[PDB]
Design a protein around this ligand. Sequence first.
Ligand SMILES: [Cl-]
Ligand SMILES: [Cl-]
Ligand SMILES: [Fe+3]
Ligand SMILES: [Fe+3]
Ligand SMILES: [Fe+3]
Ligand SMILES: [Fe+3]
Lengths: 102, 102, 491, 491, 304, 304, 83, 83
Amino acid sequence: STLADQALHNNNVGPIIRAGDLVEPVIETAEIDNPGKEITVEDRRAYVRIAAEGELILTRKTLEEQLGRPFNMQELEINLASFAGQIQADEDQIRFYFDKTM
Amino acid sequence: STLADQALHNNNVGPIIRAGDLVEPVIETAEIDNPGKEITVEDRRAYVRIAAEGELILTRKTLEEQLGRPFNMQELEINLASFAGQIQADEDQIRFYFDKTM
Amino acid sequence: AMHPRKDWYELTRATNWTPSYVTEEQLFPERMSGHMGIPLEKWESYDEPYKTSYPEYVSIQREKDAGAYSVKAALERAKIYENSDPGWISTLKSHYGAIAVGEYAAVTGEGRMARFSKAPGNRNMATFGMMDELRHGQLQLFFPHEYCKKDRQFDWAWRAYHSNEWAAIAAKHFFDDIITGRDAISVAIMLTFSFETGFANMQFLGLAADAAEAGDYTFANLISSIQTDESRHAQQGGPALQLLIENGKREEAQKKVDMAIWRAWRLFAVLTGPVMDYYTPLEDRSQSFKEFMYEWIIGQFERSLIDLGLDKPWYWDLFLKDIDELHHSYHMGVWYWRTTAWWNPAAGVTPEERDWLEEKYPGWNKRWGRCWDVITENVLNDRMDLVSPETLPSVCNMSQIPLVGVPGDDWNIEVFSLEHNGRLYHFGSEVDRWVFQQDPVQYQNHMNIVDRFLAGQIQPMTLEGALKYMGFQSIEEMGKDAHDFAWADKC
Amino acid sequence: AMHPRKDWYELTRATNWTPSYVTEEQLFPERMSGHMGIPLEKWESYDEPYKTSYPEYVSIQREKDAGAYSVKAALERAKIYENSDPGWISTLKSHYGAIAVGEYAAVTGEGRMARFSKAPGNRNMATFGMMDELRHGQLQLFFPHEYCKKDRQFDWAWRAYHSNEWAAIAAKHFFDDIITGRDAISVAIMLTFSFETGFANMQFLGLAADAAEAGDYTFANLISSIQTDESRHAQQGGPALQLLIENGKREEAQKKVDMAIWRAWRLFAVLTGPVMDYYTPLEDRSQSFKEFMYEWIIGQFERSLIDLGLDKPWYWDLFLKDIDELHHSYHMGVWYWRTTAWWNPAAGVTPEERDWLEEKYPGWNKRWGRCWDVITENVLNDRMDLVSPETLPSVCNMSQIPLVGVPGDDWNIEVFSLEHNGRLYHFGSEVDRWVFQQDPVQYQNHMNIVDRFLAGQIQPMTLEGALKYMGFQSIEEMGKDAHDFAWADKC
Amino acid sequence: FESKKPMRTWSHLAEMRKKPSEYDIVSRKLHYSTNNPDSPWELSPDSPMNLWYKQYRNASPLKHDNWDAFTDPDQLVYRTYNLMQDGQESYVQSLFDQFNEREHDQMVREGWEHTMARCYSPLRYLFHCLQMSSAYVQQMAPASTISNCCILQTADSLRWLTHTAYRTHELSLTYPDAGLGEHERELWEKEPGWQGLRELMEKQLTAFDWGEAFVSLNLVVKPMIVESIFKPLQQQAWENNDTLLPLLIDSQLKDAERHSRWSKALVKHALENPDNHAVIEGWIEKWRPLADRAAEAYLSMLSS
Amino acid sequence: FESKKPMRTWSHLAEMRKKPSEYDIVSRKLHYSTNNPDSPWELSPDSPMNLWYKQYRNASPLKHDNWDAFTDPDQLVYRTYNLMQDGQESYVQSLFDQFNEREHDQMVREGWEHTMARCYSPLRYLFHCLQMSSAYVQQMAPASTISNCCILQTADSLRWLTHTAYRTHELSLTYPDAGLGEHERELWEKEPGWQGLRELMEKQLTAFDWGEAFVSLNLVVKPMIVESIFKPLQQQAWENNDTLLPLLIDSQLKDAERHSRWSKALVKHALENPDNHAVIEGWIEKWRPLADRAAEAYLSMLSS
Amino acid sequence: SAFPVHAAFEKDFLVQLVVVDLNDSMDQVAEKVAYHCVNRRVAPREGVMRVRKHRSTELFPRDMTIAESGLNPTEVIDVVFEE
Amino acid sequence: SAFPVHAAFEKDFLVQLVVVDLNDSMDQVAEKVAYHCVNRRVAPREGVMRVRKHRSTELFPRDMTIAESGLNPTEVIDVVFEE
Ligand SMILES: [Cl-]
Ligand SMILES: [Cl-]
Ligand SMILES: [Fe+3]
Ligand SMILES: [Fe+3]
Ligand SMILES: [Fe+3]
Ligand SMILES: [Fe+3]
């Protein structure tokens, strides 16, 4: 159908953050670390779906700044309940991305 | 007054446990470790006032049994929000007690 | 000083070797490993994209549980059990029953990979996977255990998988087919690309949204914490799938993923569908079941599968039609046969609810509404014999769930049958029949509960005999209308 | 193996020595130490009955905060700010304002003991006391900080103690008299036996009961966790008191404890009294203020003081009468002068509330009810000029709170005045005057806010000038009726 | 159908006289796959995995009428395991940090880097084999309380593997010309001192009966590793001024002792059935020679 | 009165260009006692404590127009201090456990128990004096960010005291005839090697100006303890086969370095006011001879 | 004797097990199926109930018995109203 | 000129600052105090308002001025109704 085709033919990538202290810092980090991208946010109370088109990076350094306390990248898994896109993650950042353009 | 005299002339001693996982285990421990005493319980939702007349002992061993997981005595301070009586506390138990009979 | 994980990580997965005292096939037998003949050396390019390491794991998971348990302790006295709508309490009972001991079974799918996968990074990530599923099984037993003293139906958080109750058989048939009953590489692509990145998000995050609206933060906080582990260990799938595609097994991988998605769909349509659109109080429905399906399964999950190189499944258009229809009938089946459930289904058909159903599914009132009209009028007139069944539904030989269709003004129902080795089987879709024909040795001598009833295995051969066979131990345990029919007063 | 605390604990407090290069009195000057001439050796029998040690402290306090912060994070979206009654939100604003930076001041009372107490066990327990009060100040700044973006009144969680707002001066006069303004041994018996084992239980556990009824578990969980630390460090009092009694200072100890209890009583009657009996929604009032007073202050606290060897204070019967009366007038003062508060007081006088007040305080309607009748009729007739003041209340020279009495059918008001060094002072009770006369150098040249107004220090000398002097930075910050007078519709 | 009141715990625990513990509540009687002898799994009774389980679990010569009654003597659950191991592992990671600050590795006796490259860094293969093997006993064992001990033992095996990986890399930074992190696979495959161990593990990994797998792994292979690999390495480290390796191995030995404790409790439970003494002893005697040979070959490499 | 919208943080932070950190939110500008020069505390302006604060805080020769702008370079708050120190202290307690299992104390060089009894176990008095002194700088310092560093330093001093108490007791179990846990007060009072230190601390504890207290404690006494007590004890322990004491002291030195870091940052902040260079140097020169004498007397006792 | 079929009734939402008898007419079969559907989830209506093999076009004659029909036990039938 | 007193009005709940004038009569003082009390928290009533030193028995004469009375600034007065 039209509704389903449109839903499937998206290129949205990014984190789903569960309710807690990482929601606003991640939204802010997504905005700062992807300045050429529009960041969209869907708030479902128990979680927030944060996305950009094609690629969305969260750097540890920016997230630590926005969270306001010392932060390692691996700790994001306490609050990363899901994500859209493929993931590449290291000590410095997490990258959500797609290989294809749909 | 009569109401105030009666309120002051009590010999109730024992723990006030804040809402959480220690409430039922402490009530049970108070009953088991003070078998000659009537244990009274006043539930104020955010805390529970547990008392006996003159003396109330909580042993670590019994509390560990009733809590169902390994437990040190010092950990009770996570949930001991107040207490009636004087206190004597060591690695094996906590004793709430009065020197005087009012 | 400490050295950064990137500099020593490769040594943690430099664990393949060339066997000499037994053969490669003896060490990794195809029936347990599922390597499809792909030689050991090829599996060494497997690269898990969501890594962890032992010291970080134990520290990070210590923190996850400290939060989950603290929240539970701080809210024991929020009155959820006492102030909650009974439809919400039934949602908890069906979730814990259908999930807790299945999570513990998932330890065995991860263990299958930890021992039998030829990819060293998969064996290590599956070791953390084993630990994660242990966490999940233990949390989802510990959390409902406090409610045993309130209601015997909470015993089914532990008991369901030990029973022959029909929804428990549906869950076990799915879990055992996709997770515990197949080789390591099949688990790697079937479990990760049906439940873990797919339907788990419906039951553990879509439902968490409704739980938060309903003010049940112990539960929302629990299930979204559980999904954080899933989102890490599910990433064992992508590299396995990529390796299969690289080594000429695209066809086989596509078929396994197509099969697993459909199997998961049918089970979560009966679990999650009635929860989202009927049991959850109307004011707490963050989105409808279909809206959540379009967010999680179409928009996120299926799009990810295309990105990794698979095609849309062949049954795409059948699936889209099913999302508009199937769970409305499964809800009606579970509610009309509520006495066979271990939870108390909410009918969810007060006028205000039917208006919402019509908005979310135009045409609803001329279809399922026709059936609910009959039921509602019987309740209003106290003809309660007519609101309880006196026979069994016919059940799918794949999903183990009643055979349904669209009722009312444009009635349409189809059973897809199959003769095989001298036996007549019945399926609830083209796809379910197709799944059977892919792997008949997996399924062929399984008997569904109605097969068992007709074969003399359920004595006495009556509804009451079937209930006893299903493992009910007291009258209190069988399902009743969540609100004791108080909803008809709004009708 | 590890050796048990009992076997090495004495060495942790074997820290007294005989000074040789400076004198004992130089090292422990009476004005900072408060030893009352009791020689060093006598203080070595001090034995804290609620011990801890460094490794246990950091582990146990790590756990306390992990719980407190996890609960806060899990509930950010429970809608307390959004779904709560505004009387409840005002309770949060007045608590954090009146308490957070006072907790941080309490670090200095503990530091006074850590350096200047002659008892080695007191210096170590006070070191943990310093840490505990740091915790308390930081938690009670961090928690309200998220609400700065909702309402400028939450700025006063940080700002109040930096202002000259009248309730902030009342808090600071109490804190600075009992905690930061006296020698170590005075802190040891005054702070522990007025606030920490006394009135803290009203504001941190009695209020937690109401918070839990109101569904504000972040706050209930926070303040009851804070009280767990209090219940440990307050046990520095008992051994100090015992040592004073043993060494012939019973009289002095009794006077200090009698003074501190009365000072704390007056401040918590204005803070906690209106919260419990008016701002907290009726359905959430676990007990009345008086019932909580009889539980915590009479039944538990005063009984403990008798057990430790003190007598009932001389003003016992005055105190008992005050518990029936004082806070009803303080509430009325805070509400009528709401524009001078940094929170929005709830009137709390709908008919259903007045019925509860009459049950909890027989005679209420013929006393305070007479005043509320006038106010209610003015609101109903939209004579709003008559519901806002055009002058200042007269204020106590001890408690810094308005001079009040019983209104209505058996009107009774008494000001206890005193000439001293050529100045006329006014007090709100016999006891407050008595406290002044015990230690005039502590108080004599202090000027209360009305003294300052009459002396030209507040310019312009108008209500608006006083509000600016009180540190209000915007119209939004000044108190208004919590419900915008919507309550009169129930009248 | 009768009427029954709510129970204070799970129906299977409700007759206990004691209040059920966290361990009891979350660990006991979770393998539904043992309920139906002809259908472990809810599939065709002769599905491939059903046939595997009927052959290698149900038909094992090691037999007991109530495997579920087995109790981990340590009563560990996931929550308390991670508390315990975050403590121990934080401690080890702090040792690594401080000994690196002190340049410990520079001060080891001349040549010790070569002994570590030959005798220590290929242990990552041995420890991974213990990880694989423990995961197999997990998935086959006939009671969830047994399988839980195995899950935790699988995780401990990976703990040891990861220590070895970290230290192999770290040692290579001080000693870049000893093959550290480069030749371990070839040593494991072709060095004589490793071949006894490699034969032992390749054969043990193909012992598919659950009881044989358990006995060979936990009663024969793992006690040999303690006596003949861990303890002799501590002694060699002492002779060679490596003061880190003995502390690291002492932490790994706490895990090893824990594995022995639960194993011995399972043997005790098993022996309630008199027939099991012969079955366990038979398997011990079958596997002991291969384990003895593995130990001797390793020790001759270590002392050479 | 104008209308103003809500602010994203406290009014005093709302002009920051950066988002305020946890540290900023909970630590900054909390001493209301510096607001009113003639009335620190909300009492009679000439109450005894008001006179104390006007003399020993407000009138200090060390001056700055914005002490509140001082920032702990480590930006510690209560929460992150206990996380950090639970890690370090768990590590030390694990060392104590393992070294006790190994009977470490039995293997120290002959006579080392006497050196520990004379030179180590009376440190509990020295460390308690640092605890008392740090608590004094806390209560007098003119900014909450300064006082917070002092609270944490007071707690670290008690950490060190408690290590010393625990080890004194533990050593006495192996060596019950050396006076361990019995004579430390008499040594502190009457042994020459302790008298330089005891004089230093009794005089430092009676330096009541906040600035003089800070400089004497943190710029003179505490760096001397690092160079002349901690490090020489590590060296003596090495010569005497005590391998525990150097690891314990390395943990205590992490705390000591942290105290130096915040101190040096306060000096840097102070020196924005050119007049403070002379004031700080004057106090350093006043106290250095007493500290040098204390170090020399201790070191002559340690090497005797 | 007992003859189990799976039956789908017109306008209902599911297929149910209905046990009929070998010598029942199609009329009698229709009534046995209707008992479990009409006035439970399906509105009663005028008209003649007919039996067919599932999704078939051809109706069985009303007076035909289940033995005469060639149906096998557990086959699926529909019960529908004459058009 | 300005003369501050602290005044307690009959049936009110508090003492307030009221600034009166040195040459005000007791009648005028009573009215200035009443402005801040009557119809705000105290029901209006018939009768004559009188001024006295706080808790005193003796009333000041109605036409007596504050200068004539011997009151000092910031002393406490009651305003009460003639009995
Ligand atoms: Cl029912
Ligand atoms: Cl207003
Ligand atoms: Fe899971
Ligand atoms: Fe999973
Ligand atoms: Fe406090
Ligand atoms: Fe306190």
